[PDB]
Design a protein around this ligand. Structure first.
Ligand SMILES: O=C1NC(=O)C(c2cccc(Cl)c2)=C1Nc1ccc(Cl)c(C(=O)O)c1
Ligand SMILES: O=C1NC(=O)C(c2cccc(Cl)c2)=C1Nc1ccc(Cl)c(C(=O)O)c1
Lengths: 337, 342
């Protein structure tokens, strides 16, 4: 059918635009400040997604700047970006296409009264943590970690983090808005309105995703900040004054009984280390990958339930390990090339 | 059949302990910080609600203290309150029982593609505003105005505000937490984390309820603070710096509200919405000023009746306390035929 041709700029490297053509354009949903479509590149016949947002024009788009700077196997990649109109100027990001979301998958198991096999919970959570160790190493915080922003390829078990419309370089000393991050996944300090939060808010969110995958429903639900805190308190106990001071300095004023009996002790151990009141006490993304809960992924014989091999899991780079190099000794198993 | 008898304290009358007996304790759902049961009073065979919450001896119950001082035709009345067993202490509040909530009713119309007949939108919204004018006159802010806390009697069209588990006396100068209020109904200043907010946050919430009833769905939805703001901006335009300062993004302009609602929607309803949903807290109408808005002129008509043939509920029995906010408004709030000597 219809073929659109544009002059787009590659996401990485030399700023040397090239002609790009795509076809079969259908709307595939909705993201942050725009609309995501799916289309097929004519040259390679490969499927891609195209996010499209209105552009300020006398202002540089922050999502685009953060994206042109990332290259990781667990993050959707910016392939190109170009401008289009409708006066109104539109910015178009040409990203990797991924068929499913962790959201929709978990829901399937949920209404069928089934619980996602723990092997997948491991594969998915591990990859999310690698992606976080990576962007954090650049001082970037996603600020919207929730199941809906976790894409999955069903057959390969590869997971990619997406939607960077809320991502931001967090600089010690500068303040940041506290109204970011979706309900159920917001870290306590965000609920208490803190504006001096660090990247550990992403870890709390990830902790909520893990717990949700093991539980079969959100662990800290609530229509208001108050309700959510009541849920959090029911599990982490009441915050000591010291703990309240470390989340937000301007306040105003078991863990096994939580999950079914089958659930592995490691999973619960990891949860408790992620979901902590004190921001500095939560594990770092990298420290999480090296947690025993992921030891099965480091087994040489591990395979997917469909018979296939696991995705790339050990191809760590120096950038990725910068957070804490000595961890390579665990992160990279003996057999791994 | 089982029967429970307890010695409770009247809700407002002088402290003369009364023996109360009830039967049929059945669960009706979750109220903030507790569970609410339904029960039938033995004698009158009248239904009541009983909100049971955990009472930690360290402090006195703030919801209880607030409700004991309240008595208005559009607010749930605290009939009696007594303590009970559990190894913990449970505070029990015997409240008026009302069969439906605005949430459930707007929902039936919603998942069937119809909107609530405007006459009902008027009756319900007006009563909500009276209830707000009243508690605000005491300096109390509900802080959780949403469809689920708006009870309705189907036959009489009477509306009662409930769930005061978040209500608080707001004192100029003292700070207040900003994580109160349910998503979709939070005023901008709350989203921006403000801690010096006034009772006008209840008005913003009420504005969201009105818009929702006219629209058939929430007017400012969003899973995050950011999303909600984008929705608010799409309609109120971008906040000027001055407006941001009084409260404490891809710039968009003023959105003619009429584009927002269905065509057929009354100009008065839209006018009222715009005057309620304002960035500047001090610019939003007061509860009382809202009741006197032209959108409610039909309720002041002497011939007005309910679609089921019945008369409208009490709407003009205003008290001095209620009007304290601005006495001169009585001249409009109390229509002529409501002044005819008996
Ligand atoms: O294949 C994709 N690459 C992407 O970058 C995204 C994506 C997903 C969420 C937000 C943004 Cl900004 C982009 C894809 N998919 C997508 C887009 C919108 C929706 Cl609404 C859904 C979905 O939930 O199914 C998936
Ligand atoms: O008849 C009632 N008197 C009341 O004060 C309440 C009520 C409603 C909401 C919160 C609280 Cl704390 C009490 C009633 N009803 C009620 C209680 C719980 C639920 Cl969960 C629902 C409901 O939504 O159906 C209605």
């Amino acid at each position: 059918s219809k073929v659109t041709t544009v002059v787009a700029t590659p996401g990485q490297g030399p700023d040397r635009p090239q002609e790009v053509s795509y076809t079969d354009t259908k709307v595939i949903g909705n993201g942050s400040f725009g609309v995501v479509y799916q289309a097929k590149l004519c040259d390679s016949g490969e499927l891609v997604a195209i996010k499209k947002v209105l552009q300020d024009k006398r202002f540089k788009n922050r999502e685009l700047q953060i994206m042109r700077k990332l290259d990781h196997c667990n993050i959707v990649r910016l392939r190109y970006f170009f401008y289009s109109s409708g006066d109104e100027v539109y910015l178009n990001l040409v990203l990797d296409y991924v068929p499913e979301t962790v959201y929709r998958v978990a829901r399937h198991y949920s209404r069928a009264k089934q619980t996602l096999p723990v092997i997948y919970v491991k594969l998915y959570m591990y990859q999310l943590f690698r992606s976080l160790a990576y962007i954090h190493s650049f001082g970037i915080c996603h600020r919207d970690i929730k199941p809906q922003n976790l894409l999955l390829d069903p057959d390969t078990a590869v997971l990619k983090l997406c939607d960077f419309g809320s991502a931001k370089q967090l600089v010690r000393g500068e303040p940041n808005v506290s109204y970011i991050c979706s309900r159920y996944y917001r870290a306590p300090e965000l609920i208490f309105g803190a504006t001096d939060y660090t990247s550990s808010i992403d870890v709390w969110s990830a902790g909520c995703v893990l717990a949700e995958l093991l539980l079969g429903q959100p662990i800290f639900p609530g229509d208001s900040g108050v309700d959510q805190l009541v849920e959090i308190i029911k599990v982490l106990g009441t915050p000591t004054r010291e703990q309240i001071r470390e989340m937000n300095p301007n306040y105003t004023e078991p863990w096994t009984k939580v999950f079914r009996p089958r659930t592995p002790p490691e999973a619960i151990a990891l949860c408790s280390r992620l979901l902590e009141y004190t921001p500095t006490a939560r594990l770092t993304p990298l420290e999480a990958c090296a947690h025993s809960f992921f030891d099965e992924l480091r087994d040489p014989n591990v395979k997917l339930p469909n018979g296939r091999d696991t995705p790339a899991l050990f191809n760590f780079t120096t950038q990725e390990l910068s957070s804490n190099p000595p961890l390579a000794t665990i992160l990279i198993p003996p057999h791994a090339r």
